[PDB]
Structure formats: C-alpha cells, structure tokens
Amino acid sequence: CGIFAYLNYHVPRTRREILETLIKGLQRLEYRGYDSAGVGFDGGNDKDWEANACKIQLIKKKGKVKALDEEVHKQQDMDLDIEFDVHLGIAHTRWATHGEPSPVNSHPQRSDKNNEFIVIHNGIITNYKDLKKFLESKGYDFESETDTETIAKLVKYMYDNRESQDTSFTTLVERVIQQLEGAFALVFKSVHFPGQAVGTRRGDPLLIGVRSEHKLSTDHIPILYRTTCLFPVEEKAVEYYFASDASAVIEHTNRVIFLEDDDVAAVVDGRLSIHRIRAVQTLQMELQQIMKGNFSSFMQKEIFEQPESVVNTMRGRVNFDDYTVNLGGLKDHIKEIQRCRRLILIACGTSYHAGVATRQVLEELTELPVMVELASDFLDRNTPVFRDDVCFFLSQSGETADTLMGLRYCKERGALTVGITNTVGSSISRETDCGVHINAGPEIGVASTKAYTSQFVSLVMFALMMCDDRISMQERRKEIMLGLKRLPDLIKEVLSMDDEIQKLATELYHQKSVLIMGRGYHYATCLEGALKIKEITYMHSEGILAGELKHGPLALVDKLMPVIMIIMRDHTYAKCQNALQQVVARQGRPVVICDKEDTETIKNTKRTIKVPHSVDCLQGILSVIPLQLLAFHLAVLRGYDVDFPRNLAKSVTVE
Amino acid sequence: CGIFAYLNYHVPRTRREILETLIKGLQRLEYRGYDSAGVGFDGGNDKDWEANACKIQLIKKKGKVKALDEEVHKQQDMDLDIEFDVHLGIAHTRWATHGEPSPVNSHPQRSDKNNEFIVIHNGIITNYKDLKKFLESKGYDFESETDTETIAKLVKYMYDNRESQDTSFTTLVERVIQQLEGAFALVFKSVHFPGQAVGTRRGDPLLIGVRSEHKLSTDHIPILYRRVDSTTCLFPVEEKAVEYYFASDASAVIEHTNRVIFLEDDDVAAVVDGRLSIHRIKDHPGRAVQTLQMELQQIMKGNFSSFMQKEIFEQPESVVNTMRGRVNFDDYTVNLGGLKDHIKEIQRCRRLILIACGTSYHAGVATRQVLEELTELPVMVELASDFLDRNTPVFRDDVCFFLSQSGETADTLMGLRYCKERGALTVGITNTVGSSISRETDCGVHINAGPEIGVASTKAYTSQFVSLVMFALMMCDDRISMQERRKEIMLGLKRLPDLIKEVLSMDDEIQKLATELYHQKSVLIMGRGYHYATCLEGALKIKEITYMHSEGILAGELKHGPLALVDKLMPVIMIIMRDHTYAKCQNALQQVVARQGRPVVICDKEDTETIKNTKRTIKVPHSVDCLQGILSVIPLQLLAFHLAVLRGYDVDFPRSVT
Ligand SMILES: O=C[C@H](O)[C@@H](O)[C@H](O)[C@H](O)COP(=O)(O)O
Ligand SMILES: O=C[C@H](O)[C@@H](O)[C@H](O)[C@H](O)COP(=O)(O)O
Ligand SMILES: N[C@@H](CCC(=O)O)C(=O)O
C-alpha cells in the first residue's frame, strides 16, 4: 500500500493543482498496491477558501490509479478553480489482499456520514475486532470490512469524550494508538482541525517532506513528551509531503524527516512538531533513478540496466589491480564471523533463490555448513538457532514481514545477524548487527530482476572476503574476480539476443505449462525462471531439479509439453547431458540454454540459447537473464502488463 | 532385469516341473518391467538324465512371459516327461539397453552355436567394445548387439586357454570378471560342468535360496581365497537331496524357501556336487544363511485390481507392522532394536542430515519439524543428487540418515559412501533386506512395510514417516519436560490405523473429486508447516500416475509471486488442519478466494467454519499435529489413483536403446 498527502500552507494552489499532486503522488507509489485508490480533500464551492474547510470530499474508485484519475475529473459537483491558500489533502493506493477491492473498502476511511475524521492507513490492526464491538455499543455504525475503519470510528470516540474544549489533534491521535495493536502508519485529517495533519507510525515507514524558498528554523526537531518546531523563519510559505516512500516526494523536494516508532508528528499553523509521550536530512536520490527513461516498462529498463547495476554493486568494494575485496559494512565484524560455525540464509521468493544460487560457492570458500531457508517455513518450524550461528537476511525492500520476523527470532537466540538489503534505513538494515547495501538503485517493477543479480554478486564478494587468508584458494579467488571484471560485458552480450528470445516466445505463448530443468549452480536459475514466468505471464511454469527427473516428474514429459533445459560447461555437464537424453527419449523437444562453444549440444538441438562462458559460480547470472527476457516477451504476447501483474504488488510488508 | 535359476540335486524332477518352476520364477519378476524373456535347460530326450547333460536347449522370445510359456509347451521335438535327478535351469527377463528387443538379443546368451556356455545378465558391461574387439581378433564371431554376449564368448576363451584339463568352473569365471567393467549380476551354465552353477555380482543384487529336508552343514559360509572340503561349504549332511535358487529379487524365492544368502560385490558362488561354496580373490569373514520374514501373500494382488490400490488400502496394516515390537502401548515406551548399540553415540552428535531422493526425500520434509522439536538439534534435509553436486560439508559429529525404500538408489548410496569417508555416523532407513544401504550404514531401521510392488511409493512413504517419528521419540526419552508431548504423540500412533481406515472410507468422496478434475491439465496443491510435504508428495504422485501438471506450493509464498496463477479456471487444493498454522492457512484461503479462486479444501471433520464457506471439502479425522501429514496425504494418493483409472491408464505400468 501507499500513503501520500499534500499540505500547502499559504501557497495558493487551485483545486486542480492539488488533485493532480495527489494523483501524481499515488503514481509514484502505485507499484506498492494497485487494486484500488482514493483521495480526500476539502469540498464546497466558496471563493473564500476559509468557508470550505468544513466539508470533506472523498473520491474512491476500484482499479489502478488511472481509474481514479478519470473519476476525479469529469465530475459535475467539484469546481476545480477554487484558490486555496491553506489546504490539506490525503491519498492512498491499496493492496486488497482480502475481500473485494471496492470503493467502500478503499482509503481514506471515515468516522461518520459527515466526514468529521478521515484516515489513511498502511499495515494491520491485530485487535480491530475487539475495537469494533466496543465502538458498536457506544452508538457507532460500521460500513466497510477493513480494519482501518476502527481507527476512524475510534479517533472520533476520543473526540466525543475529551476533557477540554480545545484538546490538540495530537492528544486525540495519542489516545487512539494506545488502543491499537500491531503495525501501522497513519495520516489523519479532520474538519475540526482545518489544515492540520497528524502522522504517527509503528513498524511501517512514514516520512515527512518539506519545501520552501525561505530558510528553515532548524535541521533537528526535538522530540517532545506529554519557537521549537520546523518552519520557515520570516514568512509562512511552506509545503509538506507526508509519504510512506521517498519516490513520491523526491520530485518535489529532497528534504525529509524520517519518523520513528510511536513518534506523533503534527503540522499546526504550518509548523512541524514531533510528540512521543528528528533530523531534517538530504535525500541521496536522483529523479532519473525512478523514471522509465526510453523504455516502455520499468521491468525492461531494470533488465537491460543490469550491466550498470552489477558495476554499482562492486563499486568501491572490488579492486581488480590487486585482487582485493572490501565490504565496509562488514569490516568491524568479519573477524567474528569467521569464528562462527554455520551460515543460515533466510529470505522469501526471489531473494531466497539468490541464496540457493550462491549456496555452493559459500560452502566452498568458507568451508562452513550453509543452510538456506524460506522465511515463512523457518518460522513455522521454530528452527533451532544458536549463539555461534551467522544468519543472513536477504531482502530487496528490507521490510518483508516474514524475513523481518525471522530476524527478530534469531536475535533473541543470540545469533550474529547480517543484512543484505537494497533500501538504506529499512528495518532489516537497522536491526541487524552489520550488513551490506547491494546498491542496485531503486527497483520499481514488481518482479525483482536487478535485485537478484546484485544479491548474487554481493554474496560472492562476501565469500571472497571469507577466504582471503587461504594460500590454497588464491588462484580460485583470482579466477572468480576476473570473471567479475568481465561480467558486465558478458551481460551485454546476453541482452543482444533479445530478438532471438522474442522469436522463441512466439512459439510458446499459447502453451499452458512449461518445465525448466537444471542442476548444480543452475538449480536456482530454473527456480527463479519458473517464478518469473508464473508472476507476469500467468503460465504454469515449474522448476525441476534435473537429478530428480528419474524419480517421477519425467512422466509428465511428452512431445506436447514445453521444456527448457540449462546445460553449462561445469563439472555437472555430463550429468546434464544425461538428463537431456532422458527428455528426448520421452519425445520432448526442449529449448536448451547452453554455452556458445558447446558445439555438441548446439548441433543436436534445434532451439538453443547460446550464452557466453563465465566462471562456473558466476554462470548463474548469465543463465537467468535469458529467462528474464523470455518472461517479458511471453507477457507481451499474452497481452499482460509486465509492471503490474494481477493479484499482488511489490514487497510483502504484512501477513 | 530379472534373474532366476533352479538347481535340483538328487531331488527328482521332470522337465515339465523344471520348466514350470522357471516360468513361475519369472512371473514374480515381471513387476520390474521387461521386453523379452528366455530360459535355458538340458535338452535331449534320452530317458537317462545322465546322458542329456551335454545338450543345452534355449527358448528365448520377445514379449511377455506368458508368450514364452506358450512357446515352451509348443515344442513338438521336446519330451516333457523325462525325469532328471540332477539339473540346472536358468531364466531371465530382459530390459533392453544394448541391442533392440528381439529373440537373438534375449538371454541366455551363448558362447557358440553348440551352446557350450550360456549366461544370464542383469546390468551393463561398460568396456564391451574393447572386449568384443579382442575376442574377434582371437577368432570368435558375435551374433547379437548385446554387451552380454562378450561374457559368454570370454568365458569360452578362458576355457579354450585353460592351463589344466580340470580347471574349476569358478576359476574360469574369476578370470572373466577380472576383465569386465561396470555393473552386473551373472549366472553361468555349461556342458563341461554338468549340474554345476556359478553366480557372481558387482553392483547388482544376487541372492541364493536353499531347501532340503535334511540338516544343513552350517548357517555361515566361510569365504575361500585363492581347499574345498566338508568344513568349508554348505550342503545337506546325511544325504544329497537339496535344492538351490539363484535370484536377483527375493520375491522369486520366497514361495519355495525363506533361507537365503545375499552375495556381495566380487563374490563368486559355485555349486559343485550339490555343495555351495563362495570364493574371493585378495575373526573369519563369511556369508550368513538368514531367514526372510517375507511371504508370498505380500506380493500378490489378492482381491484388489491393482498393486497400487492394494498398497494404498492396506496402509492400516503396514503402519501397524512398522510399529510392531517397537512401540509399547502398555507403558508408552519406544525401542528401535536396530539402533540399540548406537543410540548413545547418536545422542552425542550435533546435527542430523537426511539424504534421499523423490518420495523418500518428502518423508524427510514431513518429519523435519518434529525431529527438530524432540532432538533440539539442527536438521538438514537434502536431495541426494544436489547433495553430491555441491560437495556439502560433513563432519565427524554429524548423524546422516539415508532413506530409501529399495536401499539401492544410486545417488542416495553415493551420498552414504561420501559421508562415511568424512567420518559421519550413518543410519539406514530401508525397506529391503540385504540392500546396499542397509549393509553399508553403521546401523539402520527396517521400516517393515512389506514389499512394494506398485510403481509409486505409497505405504513406503507413510511407513518411513512413522519410523522417523519413532526415532524422534527415542531421542527425547530422558527429558522430563517432553513426557507429555511424547505421550500425546504415542496415543496418536495408537489411534492412527483406525484413523487411516476412516480416511479410506471416504473413497467415494475422492472419486467425485477425480471426476471434477478428469478434464483438467493443471492443479495447484497449497499448504504449509507439517503439510508442506503433503503438497509436494501429492503433486509428485499426480504427476507420476496421472501425467497432469500438479505442483506443490508453499502457502506462505503466495503473495511473493505464485498467487498470480489464481483465477476462476485454475484448480486448487488447499490443506487446512487444526494446528498452530490454522490462522495463517485461513489467511491463504482468503487470498485465493479474493482473486476468484474456488479451491477444494482438505480439512478436519469438525472445522465447521471452512466446511460451510467452501463448496467441496475432504474431511479427514483430527490427529496429533505431527501425524496429520499421514492422513492428509492419503486423499491425494487416492485422487491420483482414481484420475488415472478414469483416463484409461494402467496404474501398475511403469512408463533409449543404443
Ligand atoms: O519476482 C518476484 C519478487 O521479486 C518477489 O519474489 C520478491 O523476491 C519477494 O517479495 C522478496 O521481497 P524482498 O526481497 O524485497 O524483501
Ligand atoms: O513415487 C515416487 C517413487 O517411489 C520415487 O520418487 C522414489 O521415491 C525414488 O526413486 C526414491 O526411491 P527409494 O525410496 O528406493 O530410494
Ligand atoms: N545389458 C544387457 C542386460 C540389461 C538388463 O536386462 O538389465 C542387455 O541389454 O541385454
């Protein structure tokens, strides 16, 4: 889900400029949830903007943001020409995991039929059922099936039983969160407090941007406990930007204030003050990073930019002149890591495949047991963990609920924890003892592509550090590092086969299933390839360990079943050729991803995808890219949007 | 593929009786699959059996053993009434590898047109190219494309170049195998050694059964290295009468006798003058005569129409057999006799590794959680093929379990030898007596589910499941804090046979589901926790038996991609049981329904909520959480069975040649 609000204080904006700002804000956050959207702004049609802050209009519609963009416009009651010197508007895009994505269930929610209080919410309230019964007895009627409504019906209950006639908006929100259980990120708006906003969080991101041509009173807001706020000095011109992510604010300003758990920010009279019952900083992001450029989709950009993102992952860490590796995030802990006795990798989805993809080389260069676990199952079994375990947590977002819960589980047992993330300041990067930022740049496509290859490389670099004191492994280290030096250019060679991959897609897009087979270093490749094809093309693709064919799954192969096989020139080549002969004996006609020089395979197979040869423990990077491209072209042929796959969104931060 | 030979020594048998014994033997070996079969025996219609020991007759044919039986009795120039006091007949079912199926490529292969030597062979001789060239240069002509023929020609080469006129049949075979490369099980017969047999193996099973109404000389045959006297071989003491049975599978011997000798690699067994001796080339090493508990009834369909149906519906009995003598339901204790001398060491180790293939691997996934809970040790579950590819680190304080119904699976066996070299304590969980994995592990447990004749693993899965739970119960038997948990689990084991019958009584409900999926090409099977393995195992069964694209999906992973497959057309089966993951499973159900999925749910009989909100539900009885996996997988076994029947497939049919 995504949160965005626009508060213009004494900055005259017309009602159109405001709505186009809310919509444009949801467009930046749409990849986090695109089942339904909605906005909340001040209604009425009075020239004097002051006589309009007593009427709250809500426009909510099912579908992507483009469905709300058109619902907002071409309306017969709203006059988009009213000038507002002061105004507050809130917006929200929802990932409807449960129930129907109906306008009633979308945000902002409301507290009554007159819209006295409206709130937008990211997260889950674990006790909303108790709150719902308590509020129903006091005379409040519920309309939607969402847990967010209990927050709106409750903030009004604290308002209908206050002690003084002028209790600050903060005091009301403070009493609410004390009754809420779970994780949440909230932004309130009310008619009683015109232009006032309140932002509190607890286990979910929520920052506050700010723009003003004038100077700010401070760059360090002092947190308070139940003059001294952030605001322009001489004049009042200020624009705030509440948001759950930075991509929605970077286009307007690069000055934000990342809140923390139970911090209740409040903008009053155009002054930001934090209450709790704190550091205006510059963002290191460029807008170009979250633009499609000349590509028609984000996913295509992020696939073709992998030559660059791989380089950025190694920048300032790998030195090819003297063959050294240094990960600054691990300098103070690498010594203690080497005294540990087991490595555990915990992650979800594609991030889990990155651990499968590097498990073998990690076992080789560290000589330690390496265990790779799906976060959800890791938690279900209450896996044993000990004080001399090193536990890695791979997460592009750094907020995945299952991976994050596994982190807190391993900390409670005294393990040394390491974070491999692509999001600075994320929960996983903050709560681990050390870690590495893969530095692949923002990923907007729902399906992770460059995050996978950058996680791959990051884990290889770690493996290189763990063995830099072994004489017997020096040549092996050099071999790997030379492969890393040549990897960006070999990726470019793979991308140049884009047209050849597209032609093969035209022969498969009509099929219902496809089996992808590989072993050894390329077990992860066929699992990741099968997940991508599932995710964006909706074909029933499955990854099958090649060594397991003879134990049952080979029965599913016939001349009609599509098959893709990975046969690279490493120590499993002969066994892979054996599996290929098994498939052919069952009349299968597979597409083979093989090496350019593999002349034997190229002659005896009609359809081959010839990738350049790299070091055996890096080849997985070059073998997965063809399957990234195949999934893209397959999705285009089937008429689906690669950036917005049905039934989900990016980053699973809730149950 | 299948070997069987019958040697009657001073037990008079007619030629008809001998041939009916060979045919009956091969009928016990058909379930392994084959394309051709043949037999070899003494021909000639001289009433004195002693004069016919120089004319070997062969009857080989492409097709099923039944057709071979017709060809036998369909011989005008053969008299079936001759009585042989001594005789050796051999028989073979072939699974073609080198040479296409045909009468010429069928076994027994011969050494020349006069049939001076014949041999039946299971396996492949790798260097059959080099050997064929050498024999062709010495003046030997081949008539088949089989690698086996080089064995028949080579033994004659050794005979034609023997230094002494009385070189033993054993010596000739020793020189043959010293020149062979690969895997083989062999039985030899020759006119120059009438009434004698020689069997040897390398990497392929070969056993010998014995029967006599007289006392035998010993139950432990000492090995002989390069004097054969009364004190070194097996024979009837006071009289000559005795019968020997060579076979590659005990299923072909058990109806005649239950006393068998399992040969080992490079053993050369020979019967000379009705006496059995075992030779090698290189405290007192020897081979034991042991008693199999196998019964002919265990390898017969009975009233069932298929072995798959039998083995699914007898799981109440096989589960009981797995627990017999091991779980005391009078004082609630567990004792696995196979681990008595090692349970002490095992409890001092620091990690458990389970290594297996296919369904046996799923049995490790199905018990990983309870093993972690009751042992408190790290438990790692590994597919044997990937375990080898990665050169997984293993240490001296690891306990490595090797799960294999057959006890012969190549990758699992190579995993075992890998772990032994690194000093790990090794444990075999097998269902085949005499198998390589049961012999080479430090200790082991025979799951005792009875022979598995069906093509897919059904009772072996649930019997492995139970065996590993029993081991987990042993490991925590000294912990006060776990007594209640152990009792809860053991009462679940006590009730499990009756709960399986209760699930089998819902067969009619499963048939209704099969008709719903009859026309479908894919189905997703979703679950988590204790039932992750149920999804993988059910998906494998439906793939293997029904040939449709079933896939197991970890429910906790849906929102990370796989949920995109859900719509109103994709069939889904979800497992929702009453354990600690119930709420999370309900969560996954709402995620599927919200996207137009209409899944079938396997749930508890008393889960009234899900039964009302879901159209079709398979309602199994509730058991202990770490045992529900057995009850929830059986509806998927039956589903695979019924779907295959509806589509006209032969569930007992397994489904290139150089
Ligand atoms: O293509 C699939 C997606 O990339 C998805 O499977 C992703 O890998 C998980 O959602 C993990 O999320 P994070 O690694 O970002 O926490
Ligand atoms: O239905 C599955 C089959 O039974 C097959 O997958 C089998 O489980 C493996 O070939 C392992 O065989 P073993 O149990 O003999 O090791
Ligand atoms: N390799 C031999 C025997 C194969 C077998 O029956 O296992 C052949 O093809 O004739």
Residue in the block written with tokens 């072996």: B460
- What backbone torsions phi and psi does residue A208 show, to the nearest 5 degrees? -135, 115
DSSP letter, residue B421: H
CA gap B558, B526 in Å, rounded: 9
What is the gyration radius of the CA atoms in chain A, in angstroms? 27
Identify which of A374, A545, A555 has the shortest CB distance to residue B386: A545
* Listed residues A253, A288, A323: the one ending a domain: A288
Does B331 lie in the same domain as B291? no
Does A401 lie in the same domain as A274? no
CA gap B555, B535 in Å, rounded: 10
Q: Do residues A359 and A465 make contact, with C-beta atoms less than 8 angstroms apart?
A: no
A329-335 long-range contacts (CB < 8 A, ≥24 apart) are: A329/A434, A329/A435, A329/A436, A329/A437, A330/A418, A330/A434, A330/A435, A330/A436, A330/A462, A330/A465, A332/A434, A333/A416, A333/A418, A333/A433, A333/A434, A334/A465, A334/A466
**Strand ranges of the sheet holding B351-356, from the earlier edge strand across to the other edge:** B379-383, B351-356, B398-404, B425-430, B443-446
Does B369 lie in the same domain as B442? yes
Q: What is the DSSP string of A510-531?
A: T-SEEEEEE-GGGHHHHHHHHH
- The beta strands (E) that lie in A293-369 are given as 318-319, 324-325, 342-347
The resolution in Å comes to: 2.2
Amino acid at A433: D
**CA atoms in the 13 A half-sphere facing the CB of A245:** 27
Sorted by sequence, the CB contacts under 8 Å of residue B594 that are 6+ apart come out as A96, A97, A98, A99, A100
Closest to A423 measured CA to CA, from A454, A447, A391: A454
Q: Does residue A309 sit in helix, strand or coil?
A: helix
A240 in contact with chain B, both atoms CB, cutoff 8 A: no
> What are the CA-CA distances from residue B486 to residues B440, B473, B478, B606 (Å)?
31, 6, 11, 25
Is the torsion defined by CA of B274, B280, B286, B290 positive or negative? negative
Q: Which atom of ligand 3 is nearest to the CA of B146?
A: 10
- For residue B218, the tally of other CB atoms under 10 A from its CB is 15
CA gap B83, B87 in Å, rounded: 10
Does B481 lie in the same domain as B545? no
Q: Which of residues 441-500 of A touch B (CB under 8 A)?
A: 447
The coordinates were experimentally obtained by: X-ray
Cross-strand bridge partners of residue A61: A37
For chain B, the distance separating the N- and C-terminal CA atoms, rounded to the nearest angstrom, is 17
B3-24: buried (b, 16+ CB within 10 Å) or exposed (e) per residue?
bbbbbbbebebebeebbbbbbb
Amino acid at B256: H
Cross-strand bridge partners of residue B200: B186, B268
CA-based nearest distance A121→chain B, Å: 20
Dihedral of CA atoms A532, A538, A544, A549 in degrees, nearest 10, equals: -160
Q: Is A651 annotated as a binding residue?
A: no
Closest to B465 measured CA to CA, from B629, B579, B328: B629
- For residue B116, the tally of other CB atoms under 10 A from its CB is 18
Residue in the block written with tokens 């709250």: A56
**CA atoms in the 13 A half-sphere facing the CB of A351:** 28
CA gap B336, A534 in Å, rounded: 46
CA gap A510, A537 in Å, rounded: 11
CA gap B352, B378 in Å, rounded: 6
**Strand ranges of the sheet holding B290-291, from the earlier edge strand across to the other edge:** B56-62, B36-42, B83-94, B2-14, B242-247, B207-211, B259-262, B290-291
CA gap B20, B25 in Å, rounded: 8
**B534 contacts in A (CB within 8 Å)?**
none
> What are the CA-CA distances from residue A20 to residues A28, A103, B528 (Å)?
12, 20, 44
Does A274 lie in the same domain as A306? no
CATH number where B540 lies: 3.40.50.10490
Please tell me whether the peptide bond between B451 and the residue prior to it is cis, using omega within 30 degrees of 0: no
Cross-strand bridge partners of residue A543: A516
Q: What angle is formed at CA A89 by the lines to CA A85 and CA A90, rounded to 5 degrees?
A: 165
Q: Which two tokens stand for residue A47?
A: 């020239």
Q: Does residue A395 sit in helix, strand or coil?
A: strand
Q: Is A351 annotated as a binding residue?
A: yes
Q: Do residues B121 and B99 make contact, with C-beta atoms less than 8 angstroms apart?
A: no
- The beta strands (E) that lie in B95-225 are given as 109-110, 117-125, 182-190, 197-202, 207-211, 220-225
Q: Indicate the angle between helix axes A474-495 and A619-637, nearest 10 degrees.
A: 20
CA gap A261, A276 in Å, rounded: 9
Q: Which two tokens stand for residue A101?
A: 């994505």
CA gap B96, B461 in Å, rounded: 30
Q: Indicate the angle between helix axes A306-314 and A474-495, nearest 10 degrees.
A: 150
* Alpha helix stretches (DSSP H) within A367-415: 375-380, 401-412
Closest to A498 measured CA to CA, from A623, A629, A625: A629
The two beta strands, B242-247 and B207-211, are antiparallel
Q: Does residue A376 sit in helix, strand or coil?
A: helix
Q: Which atom of ligand 1 is nearest to the CA of A403?
A: 16
Sorted by sequence, the CB contacts under 8 Å of residue B607 that are 6+ apart come out as B576, B578, B619
Residue A491: domain span: 292-495
Q: Which two tokens stand for residue A45?
A: 């049609």
What is the gyration radius of the CA atoms in chain B, in angstroms? 28
**Strand ranges of the sheet holding A281-282, from the earlier edge strand across to the other edge:** A56-62, A36-42, A83-94, A2-14, A238-243, A207-211, A255-258, A281-282
DSSP letter, residue A263: -
Does A219 lie in the same domain as A113? yes
Q: Is A395 annotated as a binding residue?
A: yes
Burial of B167 (0-12, 13-18, 19+ CB in 10 A): middle
| Binding site membership of B435 for ligand 2 (Cβ less than 6 Å) | no
Residue in the block written with tokens 């196979």: B338
Q: Residue B361 C-alpha to ligand 2 middle, in angstroms? A: 8
A648 in contact with chain B, both atoms CB, cutoff 8 A: yes
* Listed residues B278, B297, B316: the one ending a domain: B297
Please tell me whether the peptide bond between B108 and the residue prior to it is cis, using omega within 30 degrees of 0: yes
CA gap A402, A348 in Å, rounded: 8
Q: How many beta-carbon pairs under 8 angstroms link A with B? A: 163
Q: Give the 3-state secondary structure of B533-555.
A: HHHHHHHHHHHHHHCCEEEEEEH
Closest to A477 measured CA to CA, from A620, A369, A366: A366
- Ligand 1, atom 8, residue with closest C-alpha: A350
* Listed residues A288, A310, A333: the one ending a domain: A288
- What backbone torsions phi and psi does residue A475 show, to the nearest 5 degrees? -60, -40
Identify which of A363, A377, A520 has the shortest CB distance to residue B532: A377
Q: Do residues A416 and A390 make contact, with C-beta atoms less than 8 angstroms apart?
A: yes
**A585 contacts in B (CB within 8 Å)?**
656
Q: Is A148 annotated as a binding residue?
A: no
CA gap B405, B388 in Å, rounded: 20
> What are the CA-CA distances from residue A602 to residues A593, A606, A608 (Å)?
10, 7, 6
A380 in contact with chain B, both atoms CB, cutoff 8 A: yes
Chain breaks in chain A (C to N over 2.5 A) after: 226, 277
Q: What is the DSSP string of A599-637?
A: HHHHHH-SSEEEE----TTTHHHHHHHHHHHHHHHHHHH
**CA atoms in the 13 A half-sphere facing the CB of B302:** 13
Amino acid at A472: S
Residue in the block written with tokens 């093993």: B371
Does B479 lie in the same domain as B517? no
Burial of A284 (0-12, 13-18, 19+ CB in 10 A): exposed
Does A400 lie in the same domain as A256? no
CA gap A68, B555 in Å, rounded: 32
Does A199 lie in the same domain as A99? yes
Cross-strand bridge partners of residue A515: A542, A563
CA gap B247, B228 in Å, rounded: 24
Q: Do residues B425 and B346 make contact, with C-beta atoms less than 8 angstroms apart?
A: yes
A290-294 long-range contacts (CB < 8 A, ≥24 apart) are: A290/A28, A290/A247, A290/A250, A290/A442, A290/A444
Burial of B555 (0-12, 13-18, 19+ CB in 10 A): buried
Does A201 lie in the same domain as A312? no
Q: With CB atoms and an 8 Å threshold, state whether A98 touches B594.
A: yes
Which of B3, B34, B93, B97 maximizes ligand 3 atoms within 8 Å of its Cβ, making it the mutation to test the pocket? B97
Does B309 lie in the same domain as B291? no
CA gap A308, B546 in Å, rounded: 47
Q: Do residues A388 and A343 make contact, with C-beta atoms less than 8 angstroms apart?
A: no
Binding site membership of B: which residues?
359-360, 404-406, 409, 560
Sorted by sequence, the CB contacts under 8 Å of residue B250 that are 6+ apart come out as B207, B209, B260, B292, B294, B433, B434
For chain B, how many structural domains are there in total? Answer: 3
Q: Indicate the angle between helix axes B628-646 and B483-504, nearest 10 degrees.
A: 20
Amino acid at B83: E
CA gap A365, A466 in Å, rounded: 7
Q: Does residue A210 sit in helix, strand or coil?
A: strand
Does B364 lie in the same domain as B276? no
Q: With CB atoms and an 8 Å threshold, state whether B390 touches A447.
A: no
CA gap B520, B514 in Å, rounded: 10
Q: What angle is formed at CA A208 by the lines to CA A18 and CA A49, rounded to 5 degrees?
A: 30
B657 in contact with chain A, both atoms CB, cutoff 8 A: no
- In the annotation, is A229 catalytic? no
Q: Does residue B59 sit in helix, strand or coil?
A: strand
B529's torsion region: left (phi>0), alpha (psi -120 to 50) or beta?
Answer: left
- For residue B81, the tally of other CB atoms under 10 A from its CB is 9
The two beta strands, B117-125 and B109-110, are antiparallel
Residue length, chain B? 658
Q: What is the DSSP string of A431-486?
A: HSSEEEE-------SSS-SHHHHHHHHHHHHHHHHHTTT-GGGHHHHHHHHHHHHH
Cross-strand bridge partners of residue A239: A8, A211
